[model samples]
Target: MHTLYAPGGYDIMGYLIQIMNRPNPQVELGPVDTSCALVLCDLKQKDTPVVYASEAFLYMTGYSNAEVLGRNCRFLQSPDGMVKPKSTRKYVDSNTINTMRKAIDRNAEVQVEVVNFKKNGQRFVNFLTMIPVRDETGEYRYSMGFQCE
Candidate 1:
Protein backbone atom coordinates (compact mmCIF):
# COMPACT_ATOMS: atom_id res chain seq x y z
CA MET A 1 0.00 0.00 0.00
CA HIS A 2 1.12 3.52 -0.68
CA THR A 3 1.16 4.69 2.92
CA LEU A 4 2.12 8.30 2.25
CA TYR A 5 -0.83 10.07 0.68
CA ALA A 6 0.93 12.48 -1.66
CA PRO A 7 -1.16 12.96 -4.75
CA GLY A 8 0.01 14.28 -8.12
CA GLY A 9 3.51 13.08 -7.42
CA TYR A 10 4.06 15.75 -4.77
CA ASP A 11 6.79 15.10 -2.26
CA ILE A 12 4.65 15.79 0.77
CA MET A 13 6.71 13.61 3.07
CA GLY A 14 9.84 15.56 2.23
CA TYR A 15 8.11 18.83 2.93
CA LEU A 16 6.85 17.49 6.24
CA ILE A 17 10.36 16.42 7.19
CA GLN A 18 11.68 19.85 6.26
CA ILE A 19 9.09 21.56 8.40
CA MET A 20 9.79 19.25 11.33
CA ASN A 21 13.52 19.89 11.15
CA ARG A 22 13.16 23.66 11.00
CA PRO A 23 14.44 25.47 14.06
CA ASN A 24 11.99 26.62 16.67
CA PRO A 25 12.78 29.34 19.19
CA GLN A 26 10.62 27.99 21.97
CA VAL A 27 11.98 24.45 22.22
CA GLU A 28 13.41 21.72 20.10
CA LEU A 29 11.02 19.23 18.61
CA GLY A 30 13.41 16.47 17.75
CA PRO A 31 11.79 13.93 15.48
CA VAL A 32 8.31 12.59 15.09
CA ASP A 33 7.14 9.19 14.00
CA THR A 34 6.06 9.06 10.41
CA SER A 35 2.90 7.28 11.51
CA CYS A 36 1.88 9.91 14.05
CA ALA A 37 -1.50 11.63 13.97
CA LEU A 38 -0.60 14.37 11.52
CA VAL A 39 -2.67 15.64 8.66
CA LEU A 40 -2.00 17.95 5.77
CA CYS A 41 -4.77 19.80 3.97
CA ASP A 42 -4.41 21.36 0.57
CA LEU A 43 -4.87 25.10 0.97
CA LYS A 44 -5.20 25.65 -2.76
CA GLN A 45 -8.24 23.44 -2.95
CA LYS A 46 -11.75 24.51 -2.07
CA ASP A 47 -12.68 23.67 1.52
CA THR A 48 -9.04 22.82 2.14
CA PRO A 49 -9.57 19.12 1.65
CA VAL A 50 -7.34 16.69 3.48
CA VAL A 51 -4.59 15.40 1.22
CA TYR A 52 -2.72 13.39 3.80
CA ALA A 53 -3.54 11.69 7.07
CA SER A 54 -1.04 9.66 9.03
CA GLU A 55 -1.54 6.10 10.17
CA ALA A 56 -2.12 7.11 13.77
CA PHE A 57 -4.71 9.62 12.66
CA LEU A 58 -6.73 6.90 11.00
CA TYR A 59 -6.36 4.67 14.05
CA MET A 60 -7.30 7.47 16.41
CA THR A 61 -10.54 8.26 14.61
CA GLY A 62 -11.29 4.72 13.47
CA TYR A 63 -11.51 5.99 9.91
CA SER A 64 -9.87 4.54 6.91
CA ASN A 65 -7.68 6.73 4.72
CA ALA A 66 -10.23 6.42 1.95
CA GLU A 67 -12.88 7.90 4.23
CA VAL A 68 -10.71 10.88 5.20
CA LEU A 69 -8.89 12.04 2.09
CA GLY A 70 -10.45 14.87 0.09
CA ARG A 71 -12.88 15.71 2.87
CA ASN A 72 -13.00 18.79 5.06
CA CYS A 73 -11.86 18.16 8.60
CA ARG A 74 -14.97 19.70 10.13
CA PHE A 75 -16.84 16.43 9.74
CA LEU A 76 -15.18 15.40 12.99
CA GLN A 77 -16.91 18.27 14.74
CA SER A 78 -20.38 17.05 13.78
CA PRO A 79 -20.33 13.62 12.25
CA ASP A 80 -24.02 13.01 12.75
CA GLY A 81 -25.47 16.50 12.72
CA MET A 82 -24.95 19.96 14.21
CA VAL A 83 -25.75 19.28 17.84
CA LYS A 84 -24.63 16.33 19.92
CA PRO A 85 -26.96 14.80 22.54
CA LYS A 86 -28.88 17.46 24.49
CA SER A 87 -27.19 20.74 23.62
CA THR A 88 -27.98 22.82 20.57
CA ARG A 89 -24.57 24.39 20.53
CA LYS A 90 -21.94 23.45 18.02
CA TYR A 91 -19.36 20.88 19.00
CA VAL A 92 -16.74 23.59 18.75
CA ASP A 93 -17.29 26.85 20.52
CA SER A 94 -17.83 30.03 18.50
CA ASN A 95 -14.64 31.59 19.84
CA THR A 96 -12.60 28.52 18.96
CA ILE A 97 -14.12 28.42 15.52
CA ASN A 98 -13.38 32.08 15.01
CA THR A 99 -9.84 31.64 16.21
CA MET A 100 -9.21 28.79 13.79
CA ARG A 101 -10.80 30.68 10.92
CA LYS A 102 -8.86 33.84 11.66
CA ALA A 103 -5.62 31.99 12.01
CA ILE A 104 -6.10 30.21 8.70
CA ASP A 105 -7.15 33.41 6.97
CA ARG A 106 -3.93 35.07 8.11
CA ASN A 107 -1.80 31.97 7.42
CA ALA A 108 -0.71 31.89 11.04
CA GLU A 109 -0.11 29.11 13.49
CA VAL A 110 -2.87 28.34 15.99
CA GLN A 111 -3.45 25.90 18.83
CA VAL A 112 -6.77 25.02 20.34
CA GLU A 113 -8.60 22.26 22.14
CA VAL A 114 -11.22 20.86 19.82
CA VAL A 115 -14.01 18.46 20.60
CA ASN A 116 -13.83 15.62 18.11
CA PHE A 117 -15.77 12.43 17.71
CA LYS A 118 -14.61 8.99 16.75
CA LYS A 119 -16.32 6.86 14.15
CA ASN A 120 -18.17 5.16 16.97
CA GLY A 121 -19.49 8.58 18.11
CA GLN A 122 -17.29 8.74 21.17
CA ARG A 123 -16.31 12.32 21.95
CA PHE A 124 -12.83 13.32 22.93
CA VAL A 125 -10.98 16.56 23.52
CA ASN A 126 -8.18 16.90 21.03
CA PHE A 127 -5.42 19.41 21.47
CA LEU A 128 -4.88 20.58 17.94
CA THR A 129 -2.15 22.73 16.46
CA MET A 130 -2.37 23.99 12.90
CA ILE A 131 0.44 25.60 10.93
CA PRO A 132 0.39 27.12 7.48
CA VAL A 133 3.00 25.96 5.02
CA ARG A 134 4.10 28.13 2.13
CA ASP A 135 5.50 26.93 -1.14
CA GLU A 136 8.61 28.19 -2.92
CA THR A 137 6.59 31.06 -4.40
CA GLY A 138 5.49 32.12 -0.93
CA GLU A 139 1.92 31.08 -1.55
CA TYR A 140 0.07 29.06 1.00
CA ARG A 141 0.28 25.48 -0.14
CA TYR A 142 -0.82 23.34 2.74
CA SER A 143 -2.03 23.52 6.32
CA MET A 144 -0.55 21.00 8.68
CA GLY A 145 -2.67 19.81 11.59
CA PHE A 146 -1.20 18.05 14.59
CA GLN A 147 -3.56 16.41 17.02
CA CYS A 148 -2.86 15.17 20.51
CA GLU A 149 -5.15 13.21 22.79
Candidate 2:
Protein backbone atom coordinates (compact mmCIF):
# COMPACT_ATOMS: atom_id res chain seq x y z
CA MET A 1 0.00 0.00 0.00
CA HIS A 2 1.13 3.62 -0.54
CA THR A 3 1.72 6.04 2.28
CA LEU A 4 -1.00 8.54 3.00
CA TYR A 5 0.07 12.11 3.46
CA ALA A 6 -1.61 14.60 5.75
CA PRO A 7 -4.93 16.08 4.82
CA GLY A 8 -4.83 18.94 2.29
CA GLY A 9 -1.41 17.68 1.26
CA TYR A 10 -2.15 18.30 -2.39
CA ASP A 11 -3.77 21.72 -1.93
CA ILE A 12 -6.59 23.35 -3.88
CA MET A 13 -4.97 22.52 -7.17
CA GLY A 14 -5.36 18.92 -6.26
CA TYR A 15 -9.04 19.42 -5.76
CA LEU A 16 -9.21 21.26 -9.07
CA ILE A 17 -7.36 18.48 -10.80
CA GLN A 18 -9.82 15.70 -10.23
CA ILE A 19 -12.89 17.86 -10.76
CA MET A 20 -12.69 17.10 -14.46
CA ASN A 21 -12.56 13.55 -15.71
CA ARG A 22 -9.78 12.46 -18.00
CA PRO A 23 -10.39 10.23 -21.00
CA ASN A 24 -7.46 7.90 -20.42
CA PRO A 25 -7.33 5.86 -17.26
CA GLN A 26 -3.54 6.06 -16.96
CA VAL A 27 -3.74 9.85 -16.88
CA GLU A 28 -4.60 11.12 -13.43
CA LEU A 29 -5.25 14.79 -12.80
CA GLY A 30 -3.44 15.71 -9.60
CA PRO A 31 -0.12 15.41 -7.76
CA VAL A 32 1.98 18.04 -9.57
CA ASP A 33 3.14 15.69 -12.30
CA THR A 34 -0.36 14.86 -13.42
CA SER A 35 -0.77 13.98 -17.09
CA CYS A 36 -3.89 16.07 -17.39
CA ALA A 37 -3.77 19.52 -18.92
CA LEU A 38 -4.91 22.25 -16.53
CA VAL A 39 -5.15 25.98 -16.76
CA LEU A 40 -5.70 28.34 -13.85
CA CYS A 41 -6.93 31.84 -14.50
CA ASP A 42 -6.99 34.78 -12.12
CA LEU A 43 -10.33 36.53 -12.53
CA LYS A 44 -9.05 39.97 -11.57
CA GLN A 45 -8.18 41.13 -15.05
CA LYS A 46 -10.37 42.32 -17.89
CA ASP A 47 -8.66 39.48 -19.66
CA THR A 48 -7.68 37.14 -16.92
CA PRO A 49 -4.04 36.17 -16.79
CA VAL A 50 -3.17 32.53 -17.20
CA VAL A 51 -1.63 32.13 -13.81
CA TYR A 52 -0.63 28.56 -14.52
CA ALA A 53 -0.64 26.06 -17.35
CA SER A 54 0.22 22.42 -16.89
CA GLU A 55 2.90 20.77 -19.03
CA ALA A 56 0.17 18.75 -20.65
CA PHE A 57 -1.51 21.98 -21.66
CA LEU A 58 1.59 23.23 -23.40
CA TYR A 59 1.98 19.94 -25.19
CA MET A 60 -1.66 19.73 -26.20
CA THR A 61 -1.85 23.34 -27.33
CA GLY A 62 1.66 23.49 -28.81
CA TYR A 63 2.60 26.59 -26.87
CA SER A 64 5.74 27.07 -24.86
CA ASN A 65 5.15 27.70 -21.18
CA ALA A 66 6.31 31.29 -21.57
CA GLU A 67 4.01 31.91 -24.50
CA VAL A 68 0.95 30.79 -22.54
CA LEU A 69 1.32 32.55 -19.26
CA GLY A 70 -0.41 35.93 -18.97
CA ARG A 71 -2.28 35.38 -22.23
CA ASN A 72 -5.87 34.35 -22.70
CA CYS A 73 -6.36 30.70 -23.66
CA ARG A 74 -8.51 31.91 -26.52
CA PHE A 75 -5.31 32.34 -28.47
CA LEU A 76 -5.60 28.69 -29.34
CA GLN A 77 -8.85 29.24 -31.21
CA SER A 78 -8.98 30.20 -34.86
CA PRO A 79 -9.08 33.92 -35.62
CA ASP A 80 -12.79 33.83 -36.33
CA GLY A 81 -13.69 31.53 -33.50
CA MET A 82 -15.50 33.89 -31.18
CA VAL A 83 -18.98 35.12 -30.49
CA LYS A 84 -19.31 38.81 -29.84
CA PRO A 85 -19.17 39.84 -26.23
CA LYS A 86 -22.27 41.37 -24.52
CA SER A 87 -24.66 39.44 -26.68
CA THR A 88 -26.52 36.86 -24.63
CA ARG A 89 -29.49 36.13 -26.79
CA LYS A 90 -29.45 32.45 -26.02
CA TYR A 91 -28.48 30.16 -23.20
CA VAL A 92 -25.65 27.90 -24.20
CA ASP A 93 -23.29 26.42 -21.66
CA SER A 94 -21.14 25.15 -24.52
CA ASN A 95 -19.88 28.65 -25.03
CA THR A 96 -16.76 28.81 -22.87
CA ILE A 97 -16.44 32.56 -22.46
CA ASN A 98 -20.11 32.99 -21.84
CA THR A 99 -20.30 29.98 -19.60
CA MET A 100 -17.14 31.08 -17.84
CA ARG A 101 -18.73 34.39 -16.96
CA LYS A 102 -21.95 32.83 -15.74
CA ALA A 103 -20.13 30.16 -13.81
CA ILE A 104 -18.14 32.79 -11.97
CA ASP A 105 -21.14 34.91 -11.30
CA ARG A 106 -22.79 31.97 -9.59
CA ASN A 107 -19.65 30.30 -8.30
CA ALA A 108 -20.44 27.15 -10.21
CA GLU A 109 -18.97 24.76 -12.76
CA VAL A 110 -19.38 25.21 -16.49
CA GLN A 111 -18.36 22.93 -19.30
CA VAL A 112 -18.00 23.67 -22.99
CA GLU A 113 -16.66 22.48 -26.30
CA VAL A 114 -14.58 24.81 -28.39
CA VAL A 115 -12.99 24.64 -31.79
CA ASN A 116 -9.36 25.32 -31.08
CA PHE A 117 -6.11 25.15 -32.97
CA LYS A 118 -2.63 23.99 -32.19
CA LYS A 119 0.32 26.32 -32.45
CA ASN A 120 1.13 24.53 -35.69
CA GLY A 121 -2.25 25.67 -37.03
CA GLN A 122 -3.85 22.28 -36.78
CA ARG A 123 -7.48 22.17 -35.78
CA PHE A 124 -8.40 20.63 -32.45
CA VAL A 125 -11.72 20.15 -30.75
CA ASN A 126 -11.46 21.06 -27.11
CA PHE A 127 -13.90 19.60 -24.68
CA LEU A 128 -13.10 21.87 -21.82
CA THR A 129 -14.62 22.95 -18.51
CA MET A 130 -14.12 25.72 -16.00
CA ILE A 131 -14.99 25.91 -12.34
CA PRO A 132 -15.15 29.08 -10.37
CA VAL A 133 -12.54 28.84 -7.70
CA ARG A 134 -12.82 30.66 -4.43
CA ASP A 135 -10.52 32.44 -2.05
CA GLU A 136 -10.12 31.89 1.70
CA THR A 137 -13.14 34.11 2.25
CA GLY A 138 -15.24 31.98 -0.10
CA GLU A 139 -15.25 34.72 -2.64
CA TYR A 140 -14.72 34.15 -6.29
CA ARG A 141 -11.06 34.54 -7.12
CA TYR A 142 -10.18 32.48 -10.13
CA SER A 143 -11.14 29.84 -12.64
CA MET A 144 -9.86 26.29 -12.74
CA GLY A 145 -9.97 24.49 -16.06
CA PHE A 146 -9.40 21.19 -17.76
CA GLN A 147 -9.24 19.98 -21.33
CA CYS A 148 -10.51 16.43 -21.34
CA GLU A 149 -10.01 14.71 -24.64
Candidate 3:
Protein backbone atom coordinates (compact mmCIF):
# COMPACT_ATOMS: atom_id res chain seq x y z
CA MET A 1 0.00 0.00 0.00
CA HIS A 2 1.19 3.48 -0.77
CA THR A 3 1.59 6.04 1.97
CA LEU A 4 1.01 9.79 2.09
CA TYR A 5 4.18 11.79 1.61
CA ALA A 6 5.30 15.41 1.81
CA PRO A 7 6.76 17.73 -0.72
CA GLY A 8 9.30 17.81 -3.10
CA GLY A 9 5.09 17.78 -0.60
CA TYR A 10 2.71 20.36 0.92
CA ASP A 11 2.54 22.95 3.72
CA ILE A 12 0.16 24.44 6.30
CA MET A 13 -0.68 21.38 8.42
CA GLY A 14 -4.15 22.55 7.55
CA TYR A 15 -5.11 19.01 6.61
CA LEU A 16 -8.14 19.46 8.83
CA ILE A 17 -9.97 20.82 5.80
CA GLN A 18 -12.13 18.36 3.87
CA ILE A 19 -12.04 17.51 0.19
CA MET A 20 -15.78 17.12 -0.26
CA ASN A 21 -17.54 18.42 2.80
CA ARG A 22 -20.93 17.79 1.24
CA PRO A 23 -22.80 14.84 2.59
CA ASN A 24 -23.57 13.73 -0.91
CA PRO A 25 -20.72 11.74 -2.47
CA GLN A 26 -21.99 12.79 -5.87
CA VAL A 27 -21.51 16.47 -5.22
CA GLU A 28 -18.18 15.92 -3.61
CA LEU A 29 -16.44 14.06 -6.45
CA GLY A 30 -18.17 15.33 -9.53
CA PRO A 31 -17.94 18.81 -10.97
CA VAL A 32 -16.29 20.32 -7.93
CA ASP A 33 -17.99 23.47 -6.83
CA THR A 34 -16.60 25.12 -3.74
CA SER A 35 -14.50 27.99 -2.44
CA CYS A 36 -11.64 25.88 -1.15
CA ALA A 37 -8.35 25.77 -3.04
CA LEU A 38 -7.65 22.28 -4.38
CA VAL A 39 -4.47 20.85 -5.79
CA LEU A 40 -3.65 17.43 -7.19
CA CYS A 41 -0.03 16.33 -7.14
CA ASP A 42 1.12 13.40 -9.24
CA LEU A 43 3.01 11.04 -7.01
CA LYS A 44 3.92 9.16 -10.16
CA GLN A 45 6.20 12.06 -11.09
CA LYS A 46 9.74 12.48 -9.86
CA ASP A 47 8.97 15.11 -7.23
CA THR A 48 5.19 14.71 -7.26
CA PRO A 49 4.52 18.15 -8.68
CA VAL A 50 1.02 19.46 -9.17
CA VAL A 51 -0.81 18.03 -12.15
CA TYR A 52 -3.98 20.02 -11.57
CA ALA A 53 -5.13 23.11 -9.74
CA SER A 54 -8.66 24.25 -9.06
CA GLU A 55 -9.86 27.63 -10.19
CA ALA A 56 -9.90 28.69 -6.57
CA PHE A 57 -6.28 27.66 -6.21
CA LEU A 58 -5.22 29.55 -9.30
CA TYR A 59 -6.94 32.64 -8.05
CA MET A 60 -5.50 32.20 -4.59
CA THR A 61 -1.88 31.89 -5.79
CA GLY A 62 -2.05 34.32 -8.69
CA TYR A 63 -0.50 31.72 -11.01
CA SER A 64 -1.44 30.48 -14.46
CA ASN A 65 -2.06 26.96 -15.66
CA ALA A 66 1.31 26.58 -17.36
CA GLU A 67 3.14 28.04 -14.39
CA VAL A 68 1.56 25.68 -11.87
CA LEU A 69 1.64 22.38 -13.73
CA GLY A 70 4.60 20.21 -12.82
CA ARG A 71 5.60 22.40 -9.88
CA ASN A 72 5.62 21.72 -6.15
CA CYS A 73 3.08 23.72 -4.16
CA ARG A 74 5.79 24.98 -1.83
CA PHE A 75 6.67 27.72 -4.31
CA LEU A 76 3.63 29.48 -2.94
CA GLN A 77 5.49 29.51 0.37
CA SER A 78 7.88 31.92 -1.36
CA PRO A 79 9.05 33.02 -4.73
CA ASP A 80 12.53 33.57 -6.13
CA GLY A 81 12.64 37.06 -4.60
CA MET A 82 12.17 35.30 -1.24
CA VAL A 83 11.11 38.17 1.01
CA LYS A 84 9.92 36.72 4.30
CA PRO A 85 7.57 38.35 6.80
CA LYS A 86 8.23 39.27 10.44
CA SER A 87 6.26 36.21 11.52
CA THR A 88 8.61 34.09 9.46
CA ARG A 89 11.01 34.52 12.34
CA LYS A 90 8.91 32.12 14.37
CA TYR A 91 11.13 29.14 13.76
CA VAL A 92 14.72 29.40 12.66
CA ASP A 93 15.06 25.65 13.03
CA SER A 94 11.48 24.49 13.04
CA ASN A 95 10.74 20.82 13.44
CA THR A 96 7.59 21.31 11.40
CA ILE A 97 9.65 20.49 8.33
CA ASN A 98 10.67 17.12 9.66
CA THR A 99 7.23 16.56 11.11
CA MET A 100 5.64 17.03 7.71
CA ARG A 101 8.21 14.83 6.02
CA LYS A 102 7.69 12.07 8.47
CA ALA A 103 3.94 12.33 8.24
CA ILE A 104 3.95 11.87 4.48
CA ASP A 105 6.47 9.08 4.62
CA ARG A 106 4.09 7.34 6.96
CA ASN A 107 0.87 7.93 4.97
CA ALA A 108 -0.46 9.98 7.83
CA GLU A 109 -2.72 13.02 7.66
CA VAL A 110 -1.01 16.40 8.06
CA GLN A 111 -2.32 19.57 9.70
CA VAL A 112 0.25 22.32 9.68
CA GLU A 113 -0.02 26.10 9.83
CA VAL A 114 2.68 27.74 7.75
CA VAL A 115 3.66 31.16 6.50
CA ASN A 116 3.60 31.36 2.72
CA PHE A 117 4.29 34.06 0.15
CA LYS A 118 1.96 34.78 -2.72
CA LYS A 119 3.05 35.53 -6.27
CA ASN A 120 3.14 39.24 -5.43
CA GLY A 121 5.35 38.37 -2.44
CA GLN A 122 2.49 38.83 -0.05
CA ARG A 123 2.84 36.63 2.98
CA PHE A 124 -0.19 34.74 4.23
CA VAL A 125 -0.77 31.99 6.69
CA ASN A 126 -1.95 28.71 5.18
CA PHE A 127 -4.03 26.29 7.13
CA LEU A 128 -3.38 23.26 4.94
CA THR A 129 -4.15 19.59 4.96
CA MET A 130 -2.46 16.99 2.76
CA ILE A 131 -4.09 13.67 1.92
CA PRO A 132 -2.81 10.75 -0.11
CA VAL A 133 -4.74 9.48 -3.12
CA ARG A 134 -4.46 5.84 -4.00
CA ASP A 135 -5.55 3.53 -6.79
CA GLU A 136 -7.68 0.37 -6.77
CA THR A 137 -4.85 -1.74 -5.44
CA GLY A 138 -4.09 0.88 -2.84
CA GLU A 139 -1.07 2.13 -4.75
CA TYR A 140 -0.29 5.77 -4.18
CA ARG A 141 -1.24 7.79 -7.22
CA TYR A 142 -1.42 11.34 -5.96
CA SER A 143 -1.46 13.61 -2.96
CA MET A 144 -4.34 16.04 -2.63
CA GLY A 145 -3.70 19.39 -0.96
CA PHE A 146 -6.67 21.32 0.28
CA GLN A 147 -6.03 24.78 1.66
CA CYS A 148 -7.98 27.50 3.45
CA GLU A 149 -7.11 30.87 4.99
By TM-score, the best candidate is 1
Ranking by TM-score: 1, 3, 2
Per-candidate RMSD vs. true structure? 5.1, 9.7, 8.8
Question: Candidate 1: lDDT of 124?
Answer: 91
Compose the digit string of candidate 2's lDDT tens values, residues 1-149. 12222244324454454344433432233433356788877776656667677889889878887777767666665533243446542323345666656766675666777667777877767888776665555567777778865
Worst window of 10 by summed lDDT in candidate 1: 80-89
lDDT string, candidate 1, 72-126, tens digits: 7777777562333224346668677677878877877788898888888889998
TM-scores, all candidates, are 0.79, 0.65, 0.67
What pairs collide in candidate 2? none
lDDT of 3 by residue, 97-142 (tens): 5555576667566777776666776677777777665644556566
- Regions of candidate 3 where Cα sits further than 4 Å from its true position: 1-35, 81-93
Displacement of the residue 65 alpha carbon in candidate 1, Å: 1.2
Over 4 Å off, model 2: 1-33, 79-97
